[PDB]
Design a protein around this ligand. Structure first.
Ligand SMILES: [K+]
Ligand SMILES: [K+]
Ligand SMILES: [K+]
Ligand SMILES: [K+]
Lengths: 556, 556
């Protein structure tokens, strides 16, 4: 009935047998128990000529309180594809350790569309996030040590942008002063902690093509500035070698499985606002060699995660999407029309009509702006009536797109058969003219404007004076030709979370612009950003427990 | 040939095949690749009424700038016992991650007496220290959250004794102020970081009998005090279940091997000054059920590690040592006699006899105070003369103990055959009257006095006023009947590191006394303690590197 019940009651295959389904020898894998394995990244060099699998991006409409979660569809579509005899696998992100102790934690997907072992994935898993945190904190220690030991690079300690990290929900570490207790114990400065997944190490980890590229990106990281305002890099500190060493094992993608034994890579986990919201390039590229179909996803709605998957990841990974699945629900669209959280169980075509343009804007963006075959996945809910479901299908058909019902949550891979059938159809029959919505040689401001106008539907962008200054400085430093990562709210196409549906007559306000040199993109900031979540009054930690066997209870 | 070259060239068995030597099937072990495995701690409870293996404690004379073992002897002796057809295994500590990036990694042992894989052990290994850190930092976050959300327990944030941690040599975190940035972001307070291995979680982890005992020790931890001076525990914050959950897999002992395939547990790693300097109780007790002989060790010289192994660990684990090996070198003895670091290669029987009393005191302690069969191990060195060796043997025999030559560094197991014979002999023939040198009934000050008097050969102890008040306070809080852990210099029997040989007519100055309630012992402080070491001018990290293939270089 519950997710954990279904997970712990399911009969699961040994990971070797899962690895066999994607043509991996037992010399290619390293066991972490019977149900987890790391796959060596060096084998990707052997498949240099094999040609990529069909790539299916699961995205969604702007998230709402009604549902939803697109991962059940990602898992389900992978399960359904294998039930139709296709050699398919999936690539997901790994979840952060911190929130599990705040707000319980949950399944990668849910119902009969999950990945397992759930307990391991929601704790240490294979240790990647620890390795990522250790790299981040080595760099922090080496920055301060260099200053402490003489400061030949002339780093202004007040201008260190690099932050420490920990994978806990600890608001107490948001703003600190460290290096206190006299000259024997450091150099006093203002500092702060991000949760590990927010570190630039994570974005670099997830965007590296190979171990060589990983080290190059690490060296490229800008940790701060000199007294005269010159960037100082991790390479100047000779830190990249040691950081790569700490990430040697972690960089190997993790093989797990769905409930129905579909191979699954769970690897990496950056944010979808201040970063790109996708799982590792190494895992995606490796999955594209070892299978015939690959279903992956990007965080939040298609205005953020998909936009960044297509305009950042695809171009850095040199991969091309063959299909997009835009997940949605009737309830969510009624919410976009004006219906209150409590009143969503009642039929309302007029609200559905008013809030449906949110989906249509997304469907329009993928088909018309990006030029990719698209299908809409409607997750079934008891409340839904035929009239409601028909209007969605009707409006999607006006854009030349099918809206298929999905019951992957209740019925697993069977519930995704019709979706899977349609996905295969649009791959074979649908026209694909994919290209990123902007060219790399465009100016940073123009790129931010392009995404704002083309994807969000804005009249334009209002840059603050500080933003304009920062852009000029970044272009002066030689970063004009990198992609753009806009940090804004997920709940609306605009930068105002209240404006639901398909807002018009609006502009985006960019307050600041900051480079992530390792990641290789510029972050454009709109509102306030949370990089370190806190715990609630009654943390879920209080009800987590162990004893005989262990047997960890209270996680879910 | 360097240590890393020996380890890299050695032909090593599959851990399955190592495990079978101590009666373990694949269903008992949990792989971490081909060469590492975790063994379930619950396995111990079905060997309930099996008789314990022969327990051998490897210890040493006081450390010197020269060298002396100690681990090489522990590893080589295990190898030697197996060569004699005995079912022997070893238990060692895991090294901290931080120091590796400052002053390079080191072999678990040395020469031809190593434990492998060396690289993995000097990095993340099986992830235990990350888990231990996560538990520590979860508790920190829960303390601050509780205060932040209302502080029903009435914790005075200025009297929080619990510290955050990280496994990096970062002096910048020794003294901090956190909780800044206004009321949305915490409560301002003074704070600090320990290196992870100094966390009390490490001591609790290492002293827990089982999961039930682990959870009870965790809940028992005092994290600070209320505004009216009452202790506040992790139990009251309801964090023990969550911390236990983080430590579930970590608490399972790690199985690895020596170069000659001798089974080896590597588990836990606390300091030998502010803690007891032994590997985990769970690994030792579990080794005692799976083998016929178990060789283990404690940090620093017998005045520290052995004292704490015998007076703290043994009583808590309910184990009895059968033999003790005191490792020593001629050069180290001559250094105790006043010879300089540079002039040790020349023969000097005058200095040898002058510094021999250090060894004689340790031999006297183990044989007369503790009443355990003892053998002295002399690690061979080319410059040692026959007359020097003869003097040491004569003096040892004067106290009814043999000094056996050990060549385990150069010759491996073969070099320790003669030691193993003598170890087997003193077990069967030697009179064993083992008892700790103090009963738990005794008061805290008397317990401290007894150790100084008996083990260090002190005239007594000068307790500072603060120490006297702290001892009384603790006894009133109900901590009178707990063991005592004296933090002092390792280089001398006294608290003055300059005083070599066998000093007489001295007293130990105890400035403070602090409780580790989870660990279940009291810490007596003499001098200054470093719980967070710094990086040097040119960190080893600078020469650590990875190539295109992911091969790590420069770690050693
Ligand atoms: K995790
Ligand atoms: K800063
Ligand atoms: K380690
Ligand atoms: K404090």
């Amino acid at each position: 009935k519950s997710d954990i019940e279904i997970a712990q009651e399911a009969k699961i295959e040994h990971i070797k047998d899962v690895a066999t389904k994607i043509g991996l020898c037992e010399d290619d894998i390293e066991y972490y128990g019977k149900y987890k394995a790391k796959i060596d990244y060096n084998l990707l060099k052997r498949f240099e000529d094999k040609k990529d699998a069909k790539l299916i991006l699961t995205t969604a409409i702007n998230p709402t309180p009604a549902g939803e979660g697109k991962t059940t569809t990602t898992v389900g579509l992978g399960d359904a594809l294998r039930r139709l005899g296709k050699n398919a696998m999936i690539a997901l992100r790994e979840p952060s350790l911190g929130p599990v102790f705040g707000i319980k934690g949950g399944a990668a997907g849910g119902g009969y569309a999950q990945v397992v072992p759930m307990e391991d994935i929601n704790l240490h898993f294979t240790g990647d996030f620890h390795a990522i945190g250790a790299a981040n904190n080595l760099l922090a220690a080496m920055i301060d040590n260099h200053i402490y030991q003489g400061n030949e690079l002339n780093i202004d300690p007040r201008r260190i942008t690099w932050k420490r990290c920990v994978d806990m929900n600890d608001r107490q570490l948001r703003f600190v002063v460290d290096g206190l207790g006299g000259k024997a114990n450091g150099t006093p400065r203002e500092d702060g902690y991000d949760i590990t997944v927010a570190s630039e190490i994570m974005a670099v980890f997830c965007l590296a093509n190979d171990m060589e590229d990983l080290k190059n990106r690490l060296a490229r990281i800008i940790i701060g500035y000199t007294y005269d305002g010159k960037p100082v890099t991790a390479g100047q500190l000779k830190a990249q070698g040691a950081m790569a060493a700490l990430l040697k094992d972690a960089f190997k993608p993790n093989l797990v499985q769905t409930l129905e034994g579909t191979p699954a890579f769970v690897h990496g986990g950056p944010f979808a606002n201040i970063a790109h919201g996708c799982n590792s390039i190494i895992a995606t590229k490796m999955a594209l060699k070892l299978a015939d179909y690959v279903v992956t996803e990007a965080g939040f709605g298609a205005d953020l995660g998909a936009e960044k998957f297509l305009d950042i990841k695809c171009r850095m990974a040199d991969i091309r999407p063959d299909a997009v699945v835009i997940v949605a629900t009737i309830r969510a669209l009624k919410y976009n029309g004006g219906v209150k959280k409590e009143d969503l169980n009642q039929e309302n075509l007029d609200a559905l009509k008013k809030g449906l343009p949110n989906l249509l804007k997304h469907v329009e963006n993928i088909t018309e702006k990006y030029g990719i075959p698209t299908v809409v996945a409607i997750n079934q809910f008891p409340t839904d009536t035929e009239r409601e479901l028909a209007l969605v299908q009707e409006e999607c058909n006006r854009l030349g797109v099918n809206a298929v019902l999905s019951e992957v949550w209740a019925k697993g891979g069977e519930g995704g058969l019709e979706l899977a059938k349609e996905v295969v159809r649009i791959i074979e029959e649908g026209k694909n003219n994919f290209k990123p919505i902007y060219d790399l040689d465009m100016g940073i401001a123009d790129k931010i404007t392009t995404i704002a106008k083309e994807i969000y539907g804005a009249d334009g962008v209002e840059f603050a004076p500080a933003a304009l200054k920062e852009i000029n400085t970044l272009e002066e430093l030689g970063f004009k030709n990198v992609p753009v990562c806009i940090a804004k709210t997920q709940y609306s196409l605009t930068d105002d979370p209240k404006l639901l549906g398909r807002p018009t007559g609006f502009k985006i306000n960019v307050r600041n612009v900051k480079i992530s040199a390792g990641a290789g993109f510029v972050v454009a900031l709109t509102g306030a950003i949370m990089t370190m979540p806190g715990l609630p009054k009654r943390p879920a930690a209080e009800k987590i427990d162990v004893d005989v066997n262990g047997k960890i209870a209270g996680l879910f």
